[PDB]
Amino acid sequence: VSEKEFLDLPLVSVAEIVRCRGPKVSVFPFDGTRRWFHLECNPQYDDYQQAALRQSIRILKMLFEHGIETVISPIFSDRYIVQALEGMALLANDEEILSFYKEHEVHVLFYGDYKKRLPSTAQGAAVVKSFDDLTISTSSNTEHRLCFGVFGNDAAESVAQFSISWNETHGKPPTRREIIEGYYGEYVDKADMFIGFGRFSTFDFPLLSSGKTSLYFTVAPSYYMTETTLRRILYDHIYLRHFRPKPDYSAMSADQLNVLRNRYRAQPDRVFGVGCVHDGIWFAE
Amino acid sequence: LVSEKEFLDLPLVSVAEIVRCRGPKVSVFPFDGTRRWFHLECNPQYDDYQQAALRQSIRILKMLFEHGIETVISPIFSDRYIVQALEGMALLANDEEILSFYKEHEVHVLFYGDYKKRLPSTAQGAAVVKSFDDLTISTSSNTEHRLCFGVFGNDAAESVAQFSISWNETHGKPPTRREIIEGYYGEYVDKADMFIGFGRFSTFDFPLLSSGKTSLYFTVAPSYYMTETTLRRILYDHIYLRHFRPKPDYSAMSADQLNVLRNRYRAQPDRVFGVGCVHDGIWFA
Ligand SMILES: [Hg+2]
Ligand SMILES: [Hg+2]
Ligand SMILES: [Hg+2]
Ligand SMILES: [Hg+2]
Ligand SMILES: [Hg+2]
Ligand SMILES: [Hg+2]
Ligand SMILES: [Hg+2]
Ligand SMILES: [Hg+2]
Ligand SMILES: [Hg+2]
Ligand SMILES: [Hg+2]
Numbered sequence: 001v002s003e004k005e006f007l008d009l010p011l012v013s014v015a016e017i018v019r020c021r022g023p024k025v026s027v028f029p030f031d032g033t034r035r036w037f038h039l040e041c042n043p044q045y046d047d048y049q050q051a052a053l054r055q056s057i058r059i060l061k062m063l064f065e066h067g068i069e070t071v072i073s074p075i076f077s078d079r080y081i082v083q084a085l086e087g088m089a090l091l092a093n094d095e096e097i098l099s100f101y102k103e104h105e106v107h108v109l110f111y112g113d114y115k116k117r118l119p120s121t122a123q124g125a126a127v128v129k130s131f132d133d134l135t136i137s138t139s140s141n142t143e144h145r146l147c148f149g150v151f152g153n154d155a156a157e158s159v160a161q162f163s164i165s166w167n168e169t170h171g172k173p174p175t176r177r178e179i180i181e182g183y184y185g186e187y188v189d190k191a192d193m194f195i196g197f198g199r200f201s202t203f204d205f206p207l208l209s210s211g212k213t214s215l216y217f218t219v220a221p222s223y224y225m226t227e228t229t230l231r232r233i234l235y236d237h238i239y240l241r242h243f244r245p246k247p248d249y250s251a252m253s254a255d256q257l258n259v260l261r262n263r264y265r266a267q268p269d270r271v272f273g274v275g276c277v278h279d280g281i282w283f284a285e
Numbered sequence: 286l287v288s289e290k291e292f293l294d295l296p297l298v299s300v301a302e303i304v305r306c307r308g309p310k311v312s313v314f315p316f317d318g319t320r321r322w323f324h325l326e327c328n329p330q331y332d333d334y335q336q337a338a339l340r341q342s343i344r345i346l347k348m349l350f351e352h353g354i355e356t357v358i359s360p361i362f363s364d365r366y367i368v369q370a371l372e373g374m375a376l377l378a379n380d381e382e383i384l385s386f387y388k389e390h391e392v393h394v395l396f397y398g399d400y401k402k403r404l405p406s407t408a409q410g411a412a413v414v415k416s417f418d419d420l421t422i423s424t425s426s427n428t429e430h431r432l433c434f435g436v437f438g439n440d441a442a443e444s445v446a447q448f449s450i451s452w453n454e455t456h457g458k459p460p461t462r463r464e465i466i467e468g469y470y471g472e473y474v475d476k477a478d479m480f481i482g483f484g485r486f487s488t489f490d491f492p493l494l495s496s497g498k499t500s501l502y503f504t505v506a507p508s509y510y511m512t513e514t515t516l517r518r519i520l521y522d523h524i525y526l527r528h529f530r531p532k533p534d535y536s537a538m539s540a541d542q543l544n545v546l547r548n549r550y551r552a553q554p555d556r557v558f559g560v561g562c563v564h565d566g567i568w569f570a
């Protein structure tokens with residue numbers, strides 16, 4: 001199949017293909033949101049939290065409708081932490097997003113070191129409580145998994161303590177699967193893709209990174225993401241990353257090999273990720 | 286403080302001064318695209334692949350260390366017959382030219398990963414493992430640089446589990462993050478500062494050390510086409526461009542700056558780095 005045919009597909013057909021070929025697990029932190037907010041909304045009159053939440057919901061809905069089973073979205077990571085508290089509480093208390101979870105049969109989970117890192121206040125305790133109640137409440141949903149990262153950047157010590165307790169309880173060391181279940185709440189084998197933004201970087205999906213995880217970096221802030229963009233990414237992941245057969249270099253004509261060869265010898269300094277800063281902003285070249 | 290051209294133009298000593306100052310302290314650099322490189326640059330039946338490859342590996346590691354990078358992490362083998370990989374592995378601990386390299390450039394060499402369990406239980410496999418151990422003892426008096434070779438170093442969860450259980454049993458309490466990193470790698474490093482990849486946008490095999498601050502790069506040409514210029518464009522980007530200050534003040538921008546940004550982000554198709562194209566059976570970013 002070609003790209004245009006994929007783009008032209010009905011949503012249901014696309015979704016069938018994604019449930020078939022993957023990605024089963026997409027990591028998608030919503031990035032560049034401040035820039036987005038300053039370009040698309042009115043900063044002193046519009047509320048940043050609510051505008052952001054609406055965009056988040058639009059995109060999570062788009063991802064789940066395209067057949068992606070699990071989305072991992074880092075929310076907060078290593079100015080006042082109390083400010084982040086409100087935005088967080090929205091994820092468990094906003095009526096529209098609750099309506100969304102129920103309608104799309106989404107199971108919501110939270111991962112990371114938040115219980116210890118969040119402030120020891122009535123407020124922080126309240127958010128943590130919201131998280132537990134939301135994960136319990138949506139646990140009967142079976143169609144999609146949504147995993148919110150809150151201080152979910154480094155799981156080493158968490159995994160150490162979990163493994164120690166596990167050994168004392170069950171008499172033996174936990175498996176990789178059991179470790180992943182202990183950290184995330186449920187099991188998934190790996191991340192199939194990470195959709196990043198701006199400066200080429202990935203973060204906050206511990207235990208799940210692999211050389212098979214397809215990496216993408218949008219130029220525009222995450223909230224500009226359309227169906228067509230998402231589908232170009234999906235098309236690359238499904239049809240282009242594991243393209244077969246592997247190149248038989250020995251079956252190529254001398255002109256083919258020469259084209260490749262002279263290209264690599266002429267510009268051996270072409271590096272994706274090397275950018276340029278203009279007007280205070282980094283742009284990939 | 287500097288433009289790209291000025292950086293490219295600096296004497297090696299000055300570049301190394303800057304790198305010791307601003308980082309990267311730790312670069313992850315798997316040598317990738319080596320089959321393509323070898324078929325483009327060499328004559329498959331008449332040139333020896335092991336030594337052509339080894340020669341390039343040494344050139345690049347030497348280049349990296351001379352530019353002031355303290356620690357290089359290089360994934361070697363990662364999840365055809367495993368016995369085939371054994372020879373290439375043994376070269377890293379037995380080839381006289383590379384041992385001479387470790388000596389002249391004062392490199393401490395370490396091996397990480399699940400290799401002791403995953404390598405074949407044969408005289409050959411055990412010989413390779415023992416040579417890894419002995420190389421690490423033999424170079425442990427070198428202090429100027431750290432070189433870490435990954436052999437099945439793709440997934441550290443169960444290794445960390447067992448390590449932590451054992452640690453708690455003996456060394457009295459749960460091991461700290463630092464202690465876990467030391468247990469897995471042999472020594473301590475805070476994080477990876479950059480990853481230099483190739484072709485399809487992907488990273489792999491540096492467990493425990495990935496951060497949102499890890500700068501990501503992907504060369505178009507196979508690793509062995511790397512020159513000083515390539516390396517330095519990478520270094521310039523990492524050092525001067527990724528952490529550029531001040532942060533953009535969108536509210537201080539003219540209507541034209543916002544308009545340009547805005548119409549760039551609104552325009553379709555929008556550039557997604559990582560979405561490639563396959564021509565002649567090969568993926569191109
Ligand atoms: Hg503002
Ligand atoms: Hg769905
Ligand atoms: Hg679930
Ligand atoms: Hg749950
Ligand atoms: Hg998850
Ligand atoms: Hg248990
Ligand atoms: Hg621009
Ligand atoms: Hg060949
Ligand atoms: Hg050096
Ligand atoms: Hg050392």
Ligand SMILES: [Hg+2]
Nearest residue numbers: 358433470474
């Ligand atoms: Hg290391």
Ligand SMILES: [Hg+2]
Nearest residue numbers: 259564565569
């Ligand atoms: Hg081409």
